[PDB]
Amino acid sequence: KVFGRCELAAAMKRHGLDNYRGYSLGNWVCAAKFESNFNTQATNRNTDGSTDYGILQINSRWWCNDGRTPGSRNLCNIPCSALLSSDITASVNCAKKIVSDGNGMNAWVAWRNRCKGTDVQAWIRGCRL
Numbered sequence: 001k002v003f004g005r006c007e008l009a010a011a012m013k014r015h016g017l018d019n020y021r022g023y024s025l026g027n028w029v030c031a032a033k034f035e036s037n038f039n040t041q042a043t044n045r046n047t048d049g050s051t052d053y054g055i056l057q058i059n060s061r062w063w064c065n066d067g068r069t070p071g072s073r074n075l076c077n078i079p080c081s082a083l084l085s086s087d088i089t090a091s092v093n094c095a096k097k098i099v100s101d102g103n104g105m106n107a108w109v110a111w112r113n114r115c116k117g118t119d120v121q122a123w124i125r126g127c128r129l
């Protein structure tokens with residue numbers, strides 16, 4: 001599924017992401033835009049052999065099982081394919097574990113490089129939430 005901007009904002013809010021660990025909703029929407037262009041089916045292979053999955057490009061080295069990332073963990077206890085679903089529940093719940101891990105949203109390199117320190121509220125402006 002490719003979400004619209006405000007559609008995704010609403011879905012994120014509904015699953016308890018606005019201000020989760022103190023990150024306002026626009027942060028999550030911005031990160032999703034740059035990670036996946038709002039596409040739940042997005043995948044990206046890393047040089048280390050891990051893969052990033054889904055709307056928030058959650059990596060198999062730590063968070064999910066894909067069967068093909070040697071030495072990895074599955075701390076969200078999900079198959080990585082769960083992260084590709086048109087329903088974002090699994091991505092949201094895993095993202096809450098990641099952002100709680102100590103480095104906040106810096107876990108998402110694209111958030112650090114393209115959203116951090118910007119007017120992230122722009123991403124939810126206009127939206128009926």
Ligand SMILES: [Cl-]
Pocket residue numbers: 024025026027120121122124
């Ligand atoms: Cl915001």
Ligand SMILES: [Cl-]
Pocket residue numbers: 065066067
């Ligand atoms: Cl497996």
Ligand SMILES: [Cl-]
Pocket residue numbers: 065066067068069070071072
């Ligand atoms: Cl594996």
Ligand SMILES: [Cl-]
Pocket residue numbers: 021103104105
């Ligand atoms: Cl933080």
Ligand code: NA
Pocket residue numbers: 060061062063064065066069072073074
């Ligand atoms: Na894994």
